[PDB]
């Protein structure tokens, strides 16, 4: 795998693909 | 945190994996 | 607004949309 | 859960907010 | 709901989620 | 207009709703 | 180019792609 | 409509342009 | 068709829509 | 990580994710 | 191919890397 | 190349078509 530059909803997509059935939590600052 | 890091620098899938439930 | 099927990555994109800075959890196992 | 509420069934944007932190 | 920062196709996604069966019109300047 | 506003500043879902048919 | 099924958000993303600055309407009721 | 043309059936990018303003 | 400004995964989406069954190759610099 | 169904544009978005700068081919005919 | 491996069937992110250049 | 051109300037669908298999 390569390093990622992911902003906005692209990060959530990436989390989705990485975590699958486990799901994930999305926790921005502030 | 990860949301900022991925966007303002880079992050790995492995770092992302830490946020799975 | 509307009610629709939101599945998979579209579901988490909608969560991103709705929640944004609040952040969210996506927990398919429930 | 969310998948049942929003994917299998249909949900509103307001129901989606149920899953915000 | 939270305020949105939506560019390009992300705005069209947002319109899609907001409008559902009603659909929507996408009208950029120029 | 809304396309520019959402991108160069911010916009609400409620503002977006105005563009549904 | 090609003919494919374009549904849901993918349909409106394709409209965005094709139309761009012209803008477009997405009117599923027809 | 577009959904019938492009989702239910298949459409080309040129048919999609039918829905541009 | 209109000219495109496509970065990151948006370009891959565009390639996907343009190429259909033919598929495509995605070849960034470096 | 996980195993899931990745189809269509989601498949090529995942390829983008995984491959990035390496680039990739998407060749559905095989 | 990839569609059979990852869409029809399921694949891992590591199998996806099979399709990187 | 095309990846950079589309992102740092603009590109046409027709230019993109050159990258289909
Ligand atoms: Cl973006
Ligand atoms: Cl889908
Ligand atoms: Zn989809
Ligand atoms: Zn984007």
From Swiss-Prot, chains B, D, F, H, K, L:
Recorded superkingdom: Eukaryota
Disulfide bonding pattern of the chain: 6-11
Listed name of the protein: Insulin A chain
Species of origin: Homo sapiens
Lineage: Eukaryota, Metazoa, Chordata, Craniata, Vertebrata
């Amino acid at each position: 795998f390569v390093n990622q530059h992911l902003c906005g909803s692209h990060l959530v997509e990436a989390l989705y693909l990485v975590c699958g059935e486990r799901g994930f939590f999305y926790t921005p600052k502030t | 945190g990860i949301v900022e890091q991925c966007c303002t620098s880079i992050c790995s899938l492995y770092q992302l994996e830490n946020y799975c439930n």
